[PDB]
Structure formats: structure tokens, C-alpha cells
């Protein structure tokens, strides 16, 4: 796994109040995150199946 598949990370999750859209009744929060992954050389690695 240390060479068959990689997982990239840029920024962890974030939480930001959204002033605007909050119409004085329902205060609305917003969250998000960025990340990713990709398969490297997919010769190291096999799958068992029935």
C-alpha cells in the first residue's frame, strides 16, 4: 500500500459562519475541506474474488 496508492491532503476541514443568508431566524454555518487521492503503479496489488 505504501506504493500502490497515495492520498493527498491540502487543508483539513473548516467552519465559517455565513453572514448573509442568515435571515435573522436561521443562523447558517458553512463547512468544507479539500483532499484527494490517486492510484500509483497498480501492479503491486491483487484482489481475491469468488
Amino acid at each position: 500500500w505504501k506504493t500502490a496508492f497515495y492520498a493527498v491532503e491540502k487543508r483539513p476541514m473548516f467552519f465559517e459562519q455565513y453572514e448573509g443568508g442568515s435571515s435573522a431566524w436561521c443562523v447558517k454555518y458553512q463547512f468544507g475541506a479539500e483532499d484527494g487521492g490517486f492510484v500509483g503503479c497498480c501492479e503491486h496489488g491483487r484482489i481475491l474474488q469468488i
Partner: protein, 97 residues
């Protein structure tokens, strides 16, 4: 079907005088049913549909309906800071919601 013209003419003892015809007696019979559902409020009116903006009332939002929609049909609200509509089934007899 509510008031047959035979009962009124026999109650008021006015059936042999042509001065009270059927048309003038009809205008009378319409004047006693518009004031019966207006001093006591039993809605002797036919089905009407009102488009009506509601304006906020107080800190907790009293909403008084200007036409009392039936008893339990859900009145829908939209616009004015409300991003998505919602229904509301009101009081039968009263409009203070």
C-alpha cells in the same frame, strides 16, 4: 334550500299582497344571510381564494389571517426572509396564528 319562499310568506303572513314580489323578497333573504354570518361569523360565503402577504407581529410572530382560511387547510407562506415555503393549518373559527 335553506329558506323556502313558502315558509317566509307564511311566517310573515304576507302572501296575498303583490307589493312583496319574489325579487324584492329575494333581496331581503340575501340581506338576512349576509348579516347572520357577520355578527356571529358562520361564513355563509362560497369558496374564495386569497393571495395575502402576512406581516410579522411581535417578537414571536403573531400572524392574523384577514380571511380565515377554512378550518384546517394548510396556508402556505413564502418570501420575506423565508428561503423555502412551509404550510400551516390554522384555528377553526379564529385567525390568530
Amino acid at each position: 334550500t335553506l329558506l323556502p319562499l313558502q315558509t317566509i310568506r307564511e311566517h310573515a303572513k304576507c302572501d296575498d299582497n303583490p307589493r312583496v314580489t319574489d325579487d324584492l323578497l329575494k333581496l331581503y333573504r340575501e340581506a338576512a344571510f349576509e348579516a347572520a354570518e357577520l355578527y356571529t361569523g358562520l361564513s355563509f360565503t362560497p369558496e374564495k381564494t386569497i393571495v395575502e402577504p402576512i406581516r410579522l407581529k411581535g417578537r414571536r410572530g403573531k400572524i392574523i389571517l384577514s380571511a380565515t382560511p377554512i378550518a384546517g387547510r394548510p396556508v402556505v407562506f413564502y418570501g420575506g426572509g423565508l428561503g423555502s415555503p412551509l404550510e400551516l393549518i390554522p384555528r377553526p373559527g379564529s385567525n390568530v396564528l
